[PDB]
Amino acid sequence: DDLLGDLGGTARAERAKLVEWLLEQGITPDEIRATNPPLLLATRHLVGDDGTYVSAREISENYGVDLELLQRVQRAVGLARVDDPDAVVHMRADGEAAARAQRFVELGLNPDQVVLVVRVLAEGLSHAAEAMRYTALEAIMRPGATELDIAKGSQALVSQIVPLLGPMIQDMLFMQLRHMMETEAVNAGERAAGKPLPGARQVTVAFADLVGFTQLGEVVSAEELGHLAGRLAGLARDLTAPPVWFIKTIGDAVMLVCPDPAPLLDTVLKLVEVVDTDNNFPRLRAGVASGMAVSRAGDWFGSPVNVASRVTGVARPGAVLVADSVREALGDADGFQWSFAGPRRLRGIRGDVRLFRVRR
Amino acid sequence: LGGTARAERAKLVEWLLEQGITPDEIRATNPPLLLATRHLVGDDGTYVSAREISENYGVDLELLQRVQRAVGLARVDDPDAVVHMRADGEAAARAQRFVELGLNPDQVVLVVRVLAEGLSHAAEAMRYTALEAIMRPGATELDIAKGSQALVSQIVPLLGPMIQDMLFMQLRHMMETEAVNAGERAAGKPLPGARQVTVAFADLVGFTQLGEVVSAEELGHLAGRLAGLARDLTAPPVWFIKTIGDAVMLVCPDPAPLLDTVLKLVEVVDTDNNFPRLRAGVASGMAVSRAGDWFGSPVNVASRVTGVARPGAVLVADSVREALGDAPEADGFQWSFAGPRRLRGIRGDVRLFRVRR
Ligand SMILES: [Ca+2]
Ligand SMILES: [Ca+2]
Ligand SMILES: [Ca+2]
Ligand SMILES: [Ca+2]
């Protein structure tokens, strides 16, 4: 009764039924009063929120971790900055989970490199968390849903989802670690032989990447790039015909590979053009490179992949830049026109790459 | 191979053999420094088609192929072709469980896409960390192989659990945000203990002034630098609340000093050109504090205002202008109408101004 606040009307009646449901599962009046509103009081347990708080000093003492590094991790993960180590502010679970990060430093990694990776993860996970919010809201916030409908629906859904997230995360991480190490193996294997690898094949490789701003100079947001990536893939798939291979969509970019450069430069140019004419998209840029590369599990690795990716990064919006390797590999009668973009030093590569801007 | 770059190989090959690597493996894949590592990251040399995965796991084939495409795996039109690694096929099969729980497939795919992207940037930053640990002065290939083996054996298993911990922290935050939001709706007004604050977010863009893309390693570094600058510049009564990836959050009882701090922060980032430009969004109103952080309407408005702010710009809600009170002692701010009139997830029309010194 005192657990209904200043509420009246539909809202007050909805709250009373929520409190009843909470009280009868064993949540105490004090807990309900301490949590305004108590809508997710039952649901938040499932993600580790027990309504308890901890000081940085207590975490340091109990878990035997460095206090200064703990605070550096706590802040890098996105927790509130607390300058007083004795102040009981942070949620207990947040403090305990930050403590687990010292292990990476005990096993010999620099505290600075650990912190950097945590920052990157935090950025990425903030985008993933937002998509997860929408997904969950669509399922729970049905029309007319009352506070009790929401409390119960969200509790039921979250209880089933939580056991699935751990395994999913590791699986997606591992997928990326495999790709990253396969890229690395092929790198060193190309540089030891100097020349081709076994299985290798002459390919022309292009990445076509959406730029992160509109023509007016606005920022194309992260959730909008998610939706546009799927639209870029549909489009690349429609314009892509043999002998052009549409390999994969990564981020807001598509990867195309071809034995021969002519039909590919052609497909990339067409692709940049229909994006330019569709006002839903920000502009597209593309980088192209030719050479010897090997394929594992349907993907392509090697120098032309490395070069194409870096050349895509330095291309201006609406522009198709190509390494000299691509124009040399063009043989006969073509109708592209070429401007010399100049020699350019690219980040992961050494031998200054000569670039050409390409147009119909 | 003959001499001193050969006794080098001797060391490696003998070790590789003792790591359970077979003679055939040692050449079916040339210079073999990382063979002993594949099994620890889920690669056992097995490969399965989309259809065989569909019936191994009893899942829908079309949805499976869609999730596989969304995560950034090679596109395979033929469902009977054996192309993907098994582990890659199986990870995609987990997606149907979320759908069977009542989640929209379109949105599951979308979650999967955004998470794959976030984790690819994480892996790139991990590549440099690993290369810094392993590649030490005078490193022979055996050194590099043993180094990789220890790293992947001891460190990699801690990564999944660490990323789940990071995600749960943010899911805890989210649930507080959604509770406070529902609380405001039900009451039709701010909640008990609510305080009058001005909130600002300052966000780095994904590109520098010339349109180039910031790498993942560079992103982590710059985010740390922004955190440092915000720390240097934020003094009482302004509070530096947190850094979430590449954005900082400032909160203050009074709008004038917060606004002065935000402007200064954007200015300074605009003098070093290694930084992408900074942009900021500001709102004023009532908010509740939990765990050092702030929750409520002005936090949600300022966040969405930052999202529509242009590079180099501080965009403020009308709420801030009213909070300054058209009798402000401290007001050497220039005001121009700007920005959109609508914001995603925020009820009515909204009035925005660009502020400069
Ligand atoms: Ca309890
Ligand atoms: Ca982009
Ligand atoms: Ca940003
Ligand atoms: Ca951000």
From Swiss-Prot, chain B:
Give an example GO molecular function: ATP binding
Q: How is the cofactor bound?
A: The isolated catalytic domain prefers Mn(2+) over Mg(2+) as a cofactor.
The protein here is known as: pH-sensitive adenylate cyclase MT1302
The subunit structure is: Homodimer.
Region (Regulatory domain): which ranges? 1-172
Chain spans, region Catalytic domain? 192-357
Give the disulfide map: none
Q: Where is this region: Linker?
A: 173-187
Positions bound to substrate: K242, D293
Q: Where does Mn(2+) bind?
A: D203, D246
**Function in brief:** Catalyzes the formation of the second messenger cAMP.
Q: Which SMART domains match?
A: CYCc
Q: Name one GO biological process term.
A: intracellular signal transduction
Query: What cofactor does this protein call for?
Result: Mn(2+); Mg(2+)
User: Taking every annotated instance into account, which residue ranges of this chain make up the domain Guanylate cyclase?
Assistant: 198-306
Native organism is: Mycobacterium tuberculosis (strain CDC 1551 / Oshkosh)
Q: What are the alphabetically sorted keywords of the record?
A: ATP-binding, cAMP biosynthesis, Lipid-binding, Lyase, Magnesium, Manganese, Metal-binding, Nucleotide-binding
- Catalytic activity entry: ATP = 3',5'-cyclic AMP + diphosphate
InterPro entries hit by this protein: A/G_cyclase (IPR001054), Ad_Cy_reg (IPR032026), Adenylyl/Guanylyl_Cyclase_3/4 (IPR050697), Nucleotide_cyclase (IPR029787)
Q: What does the similarity note say?
A: Belongs to the adenylyl cyclase class-4/guanylyl cyclase family.
